[PDB]
Each structure stands twice: as structure tokens, then as C-alpha cells.
Structure 1
Amino acid sequence: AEIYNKDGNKVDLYGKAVGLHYFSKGNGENSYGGNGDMTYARLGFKGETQINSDLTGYGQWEYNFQGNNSEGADAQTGNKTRLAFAGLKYADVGSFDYGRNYGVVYDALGYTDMLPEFGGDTAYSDDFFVGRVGGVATYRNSNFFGLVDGLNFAVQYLGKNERDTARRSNGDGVGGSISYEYEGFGIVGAYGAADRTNLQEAQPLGNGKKAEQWATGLKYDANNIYLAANYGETRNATPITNKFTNTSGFANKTQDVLLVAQYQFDFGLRPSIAYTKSKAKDVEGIGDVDLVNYFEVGATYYFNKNMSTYVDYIINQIDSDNKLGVGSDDTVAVGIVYQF
């Protein structure tokens, strides 16, 4: 929501209140999403200054505020700056931005990441190129320098982030993506590679000096129809946990498939179904093992652009004897969303 627009400068102060509850059997963990309260709220700004007829500047910040914490010592648990970056766009030259921003491979992963509650199970936070990641410099250009309508591309440089956990750490890397759209159809490819930190190599799981993530996506999004498919592979990049040994790290190689089918009725309901399967290979001590496997059925009912409610049921296909102890139970989500 835009709350300031004077002297050629405009600020969208947006956010949301998401009442959310999760339902799984018993206590939670051998489930997909867990059980209990998951309420959260968001705040953020989208700021934009027009320097001249061709040149625009912008900056955006966004925070995730949890509502499922007490006011005691754990009051801060699960809070995070999601985005904080700044950039410029000059005519048909393109845009360039630095700060904490979404990885470049996500341009593909965005295709199937559309569910009411869950989904996008391969868009891990702070996981190199597949999700939000700090210290990325990205150049983007839409329509190929303005010369070919629908042909957009991007290149991203990922700065070294030597963090405390090998899960959240990353070395220097580069990635790129191209997407093309014509009369409802879309195709996209994205690939990124990066150095790994020593702390990442000294982890029990994973072997390599280079992390690699690539993903392609197809979609049709027109006439109230949204369909999407994503296929991707990772090399020494997907974060994983051995639940029996309490050992952590990254999987040597993973194969990710996402299918999404949704329709938007004019009276407000948007039924959604999905299937996502991400399986790892050459996991040390285990070999081949499935990380994510589910069929999804759910629906969003939109009261308006300010209010909605939804329910999303994940049928988890992971086996109870999953070699990483991955939760096998189903999970259903109940949500009521006010936003601006």
C-alpha cells in the first residue's frame, strides 16, 4: 500500500497479518509441517524515486514477525529480515541491485511456488542460489534491452558469506537465468555455481569444492488458468539433516520436480493442487534417499485484495522408515489473512 507520493518519490508500506494454524497428528515432527500455532505478521516498504525519464531508483526492506511466541525469553524466535536491498534501473539498459535478495535460480523456482500455504519446498532460505540470500549483486534486463518483447534475463554475483553454520554459509559464486513469455506461455532456465566454505566441507554430509543449482520452468498463466512445472538439479547444495545420527550437511546430488495446477474462479475461490518430489543421491552412508514427496490439495477463498482465507492439505508420501527420518505424516493448514 502506497502511503507517500510527492516530489516524485513513492513508498509502499505493505504488510500482512496472517492467522495460521497447522494440523498434524500427535505432537508434530514425524509430520510434514508440524502441529500447532503458526501465526505471523509482516511489515515492509517498497520505495521508489524517479531520477529522470529513463532512470529510476529503488529500495525495499521487509521483516518477518512471528505471532506464535510468548513475551518471555523466546520472544524473538523466528524473526528475520527477509529483504533489505537497493538498486537502479536505467531505461532499457536494465536493473542492478545490492543487499539481501532472492537468489537468481529462484526466477525458475518461482513458477511452481504458488500454493495456498506450503510448496516451494526447494526454495531454501540462505541456500546459495535457490532462495533469499544476503550480499547478492544482480543485473536484470527485460525484453532483451527492449528489443524483443517477452525475452527477459538476469545475471547474479554472490558474495562470500562465512557464517557460523555450514547450513547458512556460502563462498563466492555466480549464476544467471533467462525467461521467455508469449501470449500466456512461459519458459525459464537458471543456473548458479559457488565456492564452498571450509566449514561447509568439514560437515559430515557432502563432497565438493563447488555448489551447483539449476532449474527450469514452464508455465501457462492466462484465462484464469495457472499451470506450472519445474525441474531442477543440485550438486552439493541441498541442505539435509540425519535425524538418527543428529548429523547435518548437504546432499551430494538432488533431483527436484514440481507440478502445480490451479484455477481462479471469478467468485473468489482458487482451488489448488500440486505434486513435489525432491530426492537426494549419493548421501554418504545412505546413498539414495527421498527428501520431499507429496501430493497437495488446497484452496484459497478471496474476500478481496485485502482479505482471504485458505486451507491446504499436504499428503506426504515419505516412508516412516525414511533413511533420514524425514516426517511421513500429512499436514493441513488453516489460514486467515488480512493484508495491505
Structure 2
Amino acid sequence: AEIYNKDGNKVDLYGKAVGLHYFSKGNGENSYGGNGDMTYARLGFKGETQINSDLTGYGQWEYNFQGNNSEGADAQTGNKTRLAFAGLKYADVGSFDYGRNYGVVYDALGYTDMLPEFGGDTAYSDDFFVGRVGGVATYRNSNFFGLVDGLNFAVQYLGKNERDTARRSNGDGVGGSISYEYEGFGIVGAYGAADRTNLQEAQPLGNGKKAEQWATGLKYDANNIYLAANYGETRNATPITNKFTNTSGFANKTQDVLLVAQYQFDFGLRPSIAYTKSKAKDVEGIGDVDLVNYFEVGATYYFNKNMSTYVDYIINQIDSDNKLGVGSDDTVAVGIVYQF
């Protein structure tokens, strides 16, 4: 909701309150999504100022407040800043911003990241180029300088981030994306590679000095119809855990397939059908193991642009024999979301 707009500068203060609950058998420790209260809220602001006819300055910040914690010691569990950056758009030259933003390879994965609750399984956070990462400089260009309609590209530099964890770290890397959209249709290609930190190489799982992520997307968006499919692979980038030996690291190689089919009825119902399978290859010792595998049936009902509720149901195609210990149970999510 735009709360301010004077002197060529408008500030949009958005957010939302999401009452959420997960339903799975047992404690939910062996299920796909877990079990129990998952309530949370959002807050943030999109700022945009017109420096002049061609020049636009902008900034954004988005935080995540968990609502399923107590007010005691664990009050903080789950809270974090999701986005935080600032930049400039210029005429038909393109735009540039820096801070914590999405990785270029998400330009592709975004296509199937549409499910009511789950989905977008291969878009991990702080995982190089496939999700939200810190310290990325992103240049983007629309309509190839205004010369070609529907043709966009983007180049991105990922600063070295040597954190405490192997999972949340990353060396220096570059990446890019070319996407063309023409009348309901869109095709996207994204790729990126980066140095792995010492702590990352020192891990038992995963072998190499270089991380790679590429994904291509194809979608038809129009007429209340949303059809999208994603295919991508990774080298020493997807984080995995062997729950049996308590080993941590990265999967030498992964192949990812996301499929989504949704329809928006006029009275406000939007049923969703999705399939996701992410298999890892050459997992030292295990060999080939499925990390994610399921069919998704769900629907979101929009009372309007502010209110809505949804049921998201994951039919877990992982079996109890999973070599890494990936949960094999189903998970149903029920949500009731207000937002401004």
C-alpha cells in the first residue's frame, strides 16, 4: 500500500499477516514440510524517486517476523532480513542495484515458484545464484536498450561471503540471464559460477573448487492460464545432508525439473497442479539420490487483493528408503492471509 507520494518520491509500505498450519503424521520430522503452527508476518518498503525524466532512484527492504515462537528465549528463531538494496534506472541504458537481492538464476526458477505455499524447492537462500544472497551487484536491461521488445538480459557479480557456516558461504562469482517474452509466452536462460570457500571445500560431501548453477524456463502466461516448466543443473552448489552419518556439504551434481499448471477462475478460485523432482548425482558413497520429489495439488481462494486463504497438499514421491534420509511423508498446509 502506497502510503506516501510527494515531490516525485513515492514510498510503498507493504506487509502481511499469514496464519499458517502444517499437517503431517507423527512429529512431522519425517514429513515433507513438517508439522504444526507456521504463522508469520512480513514488513517492508519499496521506495522510488524520480531524479528526472530518465533517472529513477529506488531502495527496498523486506523483513520476516515469525509468529510461531514464544516470547521467551526463542523469540528470534526464524526472523531475518530477506531483501535490502538500492539502485538506479536510467532511460534505455538499464538499471543497477547493490545489496541483498535475488540471484540471476532465479530469473529462471521464478517461473515455477508459484505454488500456494511450497514449491520453488531449488531456489535456496544464501545458495549462490538460485535464491536471495548478500552482496550482489545486479545490472539489468529492458528491451535490449529499448531496441528490441520483450528481450531482457542481466549480468550479476556475487561478492565473497565467508560466513561461519559452509551452507551460507560463497566465493566470488559472475552470472547472467537472457529472457524473451512475446505475447503470453516467455523463455528464460540463466547461468552463474563462483569460487567455493575453504570451509565449503573442507566439507565431507561435495568435491570441487567451482560452483555452477544454470536453469532454463518456459512459460505461458495469459487468459487466466499459467503453465510453466523449469529445467536446471548444478555443480557443487546444492546443499545436502546425510541424516544417517550426520554429514554435510554439497551435491557434486544435480538435475532439477519443475512443472506448474494453474488456472484463475473469475469468482476467485485458483487451483494449482505441480510436479517437482530434484535428483543429486555422484553423492560420494550414496551415488544417485532424490532430494525432492512430489506431486502438488492445491488451490488459493482470493476474496480480493488483500485477503485470501489456501490449501496446499504435497503428495511426497520420496520413499522410506531414501539414502540421505529425506522425509518421505506428505504435508498439507492451510493458510489464511491478510496483506496490504
TMscore range, shorter length: over 0.9
Q: Distance in 1 between matches of 2:8 and 2:233?
A: 44
Q: Distance in 1 between matches of 2:262 and 2:207?
A: 39
Deviation string 1:313-335 (CA, Å, 9 cap, x unpaired) is 00001111100000000000000
Q: Distance in 1 between matches of 2:97 and 2:290?
A: 36
Deviation at 1:239, TM superposition (A): 0.4
Deviation string 1:291-320 (CA, Å, 9 cap, x unpaired) is 000000000000000000000000001111
Deviation at 1:262, TM superposition (A): 0.2
Q: Distance in 2 between matches of 1:273 and 1:29?
A: 25
Deviation at 1:211, TM superposition (A): 0.1
Deviation string 1:232-255 (CA, Å, 9 cap, x unpaired) is 000000000110111111000000
Deviation string 1:259-280 (CA, Å, 9 cap, x unpaired) is 0000000100000010000000
Deviation at 1:135, TM superposition (A): 0.1
Deviation at 1:127, TM superposition (A): 0.2
**SS class of match (2:325):** coil
| Total equivalences in the alignment | 340
Deviation at 1:26, TM superposition (A): 1.1
Deviation at 1:285, TM superposition (A): 1.2
**SS class of match (1:75):** helix
Deviation string 1:77-117 (CA, Å, 9 cap, x unpaired) is 00010000000000110010000000000000000000000
Q: Distance in 2 between matches of 1:8 and 1:223?
A: 35
Q: Distance in 2 between matches of 1:41 and 1:338?
A: 10
Deviation at 1:130, TM superposition (A): 0.1
Give the alignment's TM-score, normalised by structure 2.
1.00
Hey, what does 1:145 align to over in structure 2?
A: 145
Q: Distance in 2 between matches of 1:82 and 1:226?
A: 26
Deviation at 1:29, TM superposition (A): 1.3
Give the alignment's TM-score, normalised by structure 1.
1.00
Deviation at 1:56, TM superposition (A): 0.2
Q: Distance in 1 between matches of 2:247 and 2:165?
A: 13
Q: Distance in 1 between matches of 2:8 and 2:213?
A: 40
Q: Distance in 1 between matches of 2:152 and 2:36?
A: 42
Deviation at 1:28, TM superposition (A): 0.7
Q: Distance in 1 between matches of 2:155 and 2:29?
A: 38
Q: Distance in 2 between matches of 1:198 and 1:288?
A: 25
**SS class of match (1:237):** coil
Q: Distance in 2 between matches of 1:112 and 1:229?
A: 6
Hey, what does 1:286 align to over in structure 2?
A: 286
Deviation at 1:172, TM superposition (A): 0.2
Hey, what does 1:304 align to over in structure 2?
A: 304
**SS class of match (1:324):** coil
Q: Distance in 2 between matches of 1:202 and 1:75?
A: 33
Q: Distance in 1 between matches of 2:317 and 2:191?
A: 29
Hey, what does 1:334 align to over in structure 2?
A: 334
**SS class of match (2:76):** coil
**SS class of match (1:74):** helix
**SS class of match (2:28):** coil
Give the root-mean-square deviation of aligned CA atoms. 0.4
Deviation at 1:122, TM superposition (A): 0.2
Q: Distance in 1 between matches of 2:222 and 2:57?
A: 31
Hey, what does 2:176 align to over in structure 1?
A: 176
The percentage of counterpart residues that share the same residue type is 100
The answer for unaligned runs of 5 or more in structure 1 is none
Deviation at 1:7, TM superposition (A): 1.1
**SS class of match (1:144):** helix
Deviation at 1:174, TM superposition (A): 0.3
The ranges of structure 1 where at least 4 consecutive aligned residues each deviate by more than 4 angstroms after the TM superposition are none
Aligned runs of 1:1-340 on 2, under 5 Å?
A: 1-340=1-340
Q: Distance in 1 between matches of 2:285 and 2:168?
A: 23
The answer for unaligned runs of 5 or more in structure 2 is none
Deviation at 1:132, TM superposition (A): 0.1
